[PDB]
């Protein structure tokens, strides 16, 4: 009961993460890039631990955005792997991998890595 | 005594790794890209565990190549983080990060990730 993940999350660079955490471990919702128009909206699906440790630091989760919508297609997918931490300083700490489909895999610009911190309010 | 790391290693895509493991934990030598001419040769420096576990699977190491030589400059650096495993199927298992200097860090094409397996003979 009561995951605290459902709702709107903001990264530090203007992007928005709108998710519902279902009883079952499902994550669904919409990733909106910093441009924040119709073109900037992408489906996200993932999973989370619906029964985290009571001692633990957080709730493991991950999700995927394939960078294709009704408006445009960047022929790529990002996965975020991270942990929800609750409290008045609620956070989703993530690391991400961006893979491009087009790129020969063991060439330049195949897979990018970085990190994102999500908070309940913008910076 | 006797690290088994000193010598020539080949990745699966035509690149060459020529290293000396000093008594002290130093790695020094030359990374040669698949083109295998003068232009393709870069300094490498790193470190390794000069006293690995006797039970253990392997010898932790890492090294850096900054992609600048007398001939050309790709304004970037790769680090390989991995483990030497000895035996008749000797191997260096690595994962790598390639960072470009020029690129705004939290933009597209800042940091690439991949993996390389090094063996004592080419594929």
């Amino acid at each position: 009961m009561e995951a605290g993940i459902t709702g709107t999350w903001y990264n530090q660079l203007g992007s928005t993460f709108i998710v519902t955490a279902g009883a079952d471990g499902a994550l669904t919702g919409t990733y909106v890039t910093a441009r924040g128009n119709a073109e900037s909206r992408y489906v996200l699906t993932g999973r989370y631990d619906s029964a985290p440790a009571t001692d633990g630091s957080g709730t493991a989760l991950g999700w995927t955005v394939a960078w294709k919508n009704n408006y445009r297609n960047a022929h790529s997918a990002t996965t975020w792997s991270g942990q929800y931490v609750g409290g008045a300083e609620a956070r989703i700490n993530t690391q991400w991998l961006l893979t491009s489909g087009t790129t020969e895999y063991n060439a330049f610009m195949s897979t990018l890595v970085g990190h994102d911190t999500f908070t309940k309010v913008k910076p | 005594m006797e690290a088994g790391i000193t010598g020539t290693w080949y990745n699966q895509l035509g690149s060459t790794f020529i290293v000396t493991a000093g008594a002290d934990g130093a790695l020094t030598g030359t990374y040669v890209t698949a083109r295998g001419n003068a232009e393709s040769r870069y300094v490498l420096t790193g470190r390794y565990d000069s006293a690995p576990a006797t039970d253990g699977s392997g010898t932790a190491l890492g090294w850096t190549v900054a992609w600048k030589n007398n001939y050309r400059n790709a304004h970037s650096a790769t680090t390989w983080s991995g483990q030497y495993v000895g035996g008749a199927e000797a191997r260096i298992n690595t994962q790598w990060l390639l960072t470009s200097g020029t690129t705004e860090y939290n933009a597209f094409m800042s940091t690439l990730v991949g993996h390389d397996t090094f063996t004592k003979v080419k594929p």
Binding site: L13, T33, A34, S40, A74, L98 | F108
Partner: peptide, 8 residues
């Protein structure tokens, strides 16, 4: 060059 994840 460009990608929506990093757009300003």
């Amino acid at each position: 060059w460009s990608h929506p994840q990093f757009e300003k």
